[PDB]
Amino acid sequence: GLKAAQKTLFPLRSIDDVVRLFAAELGREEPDLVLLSLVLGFVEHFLAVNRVGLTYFPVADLSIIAALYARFTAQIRGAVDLSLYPREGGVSSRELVKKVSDVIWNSLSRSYFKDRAHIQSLFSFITGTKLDSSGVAFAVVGACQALGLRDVHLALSEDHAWVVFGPNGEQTAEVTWHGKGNEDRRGQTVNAGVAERSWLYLKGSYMRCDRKMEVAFMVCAINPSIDLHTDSLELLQLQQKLLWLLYDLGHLERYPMALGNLADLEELEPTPGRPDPLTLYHKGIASAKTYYRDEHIYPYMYLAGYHCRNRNVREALQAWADTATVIQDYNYCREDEEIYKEFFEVANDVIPNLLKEAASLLEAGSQGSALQDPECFAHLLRFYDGICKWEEGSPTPVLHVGWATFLVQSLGRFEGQVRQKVRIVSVPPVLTFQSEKMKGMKELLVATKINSSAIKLQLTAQSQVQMK
Numbered sequence: 222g223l224k225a226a227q228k229t230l231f232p233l234r235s236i237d238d239v240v241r242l243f244a245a246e247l248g249r250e251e252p253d254l255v256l257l258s259l260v261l262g263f264v265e266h267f268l269a270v271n272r273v274g275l276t277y278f279p280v281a282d283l284s285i286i287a288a289l290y291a292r293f294t295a296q297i298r299g300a301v302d303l304s305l306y307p308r309e310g311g312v313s314s315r316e317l318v319k320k321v322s323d324v325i326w327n328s329l330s331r332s333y334f335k336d337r338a339h340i341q342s343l344f345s346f347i348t349g350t351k352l353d354s355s356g357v358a359f360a361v362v363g364a365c366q367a368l369g370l371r372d373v374h375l376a377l378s379e380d381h382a383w384v385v386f387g388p389n390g391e392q393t394a395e396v397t398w399h400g401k402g403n404e405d406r407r408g409q410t411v412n413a414g415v416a417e418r419s420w421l422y423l424k425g426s427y428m429r430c431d432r433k434m435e436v437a438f439m440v441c442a443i444n445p446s447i448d449l450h451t452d453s454l455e456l457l458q459l460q461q462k463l464l465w466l467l468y469d470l471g472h473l474e475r476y477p478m479a480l481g482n483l484a485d486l487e488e489l490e491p492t493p494g495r496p497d498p499l500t501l502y503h504k505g506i507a508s509a510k511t512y513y514r515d516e517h518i519y520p521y522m523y524l525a526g527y528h529c530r531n532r533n534v535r536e537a538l539q540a541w542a543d544t545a546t547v548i549q550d551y552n553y554c555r556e557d558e559e560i561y562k563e564f565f566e567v568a569n570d571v572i573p574n575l576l577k578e579a580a581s582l583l584e585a586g587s588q589g590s591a592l593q594d595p596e597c598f599a600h601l602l603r604f605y606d607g608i609c610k611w612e613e614g615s616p617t618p619v620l621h622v623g624w625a626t627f628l629v630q631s632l633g634r635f636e637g638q639v640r641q642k643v644r645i646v647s648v649p650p651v652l653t654f655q656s657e658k659m660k661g662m663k664e665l666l667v668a669t670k671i672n673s674s675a676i677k678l679q680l681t682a683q684s685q686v687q688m689k
């Protein structure tokens with residue numbers, strides 16, 4: 222049950238009342254994940270899913286929240302008999318974690334669309350019997366906290382979630398699915414994935430949450446979307462205020478993606494007296510460097526995206542080059558397709574569109590253009606170098622001829638006299654290439670008219686040209 226002290230702020234009548242509840246729970250020994258997720262899902266439902274009758278804020282009455290809480294706790298406590306899984310040393314067993322996962326998973330509707338909005342919270346789980354992938358992992362952690370299992374924590378990569386538990390928190394267990402059309406591995410460790418150096422498991426440099434970071438996760442998980450064209454202003458404000466609460470308490474210290482998510486919100490609607498979005502993106506990068514060996518991709522892609530939206534071509538290119546410098550030390554594995562898609566869209570859609578506008582502006586007499594800056598050309602080259610190096614040693618190739626056309630076009634946006642100014646230096650602007658593909662392309666990069674076919678051959682390592 223809920224404790225008397227957890228009840229005293231009800232009813233929640235406003236955004237600020239919800240923030241007060243989070244503040245109170247974050248001040249407790251162990252914030253109550255079940256309570257907090259039910260509250261966020263309740264308000265999200267009445268602000269984004271069904272706004273009929275809304276006049277200001279969907280009042281969250283204690284009776285309503287408490288009844289939701291009771292259905293959750295009844296469902297878990299009834300289904301997981303702890304006497305069957307004795308807790309050796311105040312820590313949980315793999316069998317117990319797998320049982321909790323099975324209870325959540327088996328509760329879900331047989332058939333539904335898993336990419337739907339607003340199926341992330343325990344409100345969704347109770348009222349709709351639907352959860353998204355990471356929502357299952359979160360629910361397992363909330364269930365384990367409800368059961369008294371203090372050792373079970375959420376583990377997060379940039380594209381997946383699982384749990385850590387056991388002696389010293391050193392065990393890992395899959396508790397949910399990943400992607401579409403991959404085989405369930407619930408109950409197994411993440412060691413194979415770590416060992417293969419996939420992006421999905423971040424070479425072991427994934428997040429191991431404490432309770433407060435699990436609160437940060439559910440706050441990041443708020444979805445203000447009403448439809449394709451419309452966001453709930455109330456939910457954006459809530460999410461923003463809650464992320465600032467977390468930030469001020471120190472709970473975003475080790476959470477790069479939350480910092481990027483906050484920065485994005487600040488760009489949309491700045492809060493007076495707070496750091497600028499750029500400051501926040503750089504704090505996210507610093508976090509990744511400090512805590513995660515600089516092995517995360519998204520801190521740089523958040524930064525690049527801000528510069529791209531602001532049509533700052535030079536800084537966007539630098540940040541994408543930095544992105545590629547991270548990815549180069551990974552192997553491209555099966556289940557890494559979301560990061561492949563991201564890189565593909567940057568290379569083959571976003572950069573081309575940025576450079577096309579830059580070319581039109583240059584024709585109109587822009588000064589200090591990225592297209593006349595050899596450092597910008599160098600960034601472009603370093604972006605491609607990291608992608609080519611990523612591919613090296615991977616079980617799965619990255620590049621194909623569909624990339625080559627866009628590379629030739631992008632290179633050609635820079636005049637030969639700009640491109641000539643980059644000095645490509647070997648080990649043992651100045652640029653060093655890590656990838657063998659770019660080293661062999663060096664020779665092609667300064668011609669007034671780039672040799673399109675030779676580029677193509679070098680990028681795809683195509684052996685032959687057409688017979689006839």
Ligand SMILES: CC1(C)CN=C(N2CCN(c3ncnc4sc(CC(F)(F)F)cc34)CC2)S1
Nearest residue numbers: 355377378379380381382441478479519522523
């Ligand atoms: C630069 C981008 C393409 C812009 N948005 C990005 N994301 C990255 C994913 N996301 C997250 N935010 C906070 N915590 C987490 S934890 C996670 C992984 C999984 F959902 F839990 F499995 C995704 C995610 C926020 C939205 S990266």
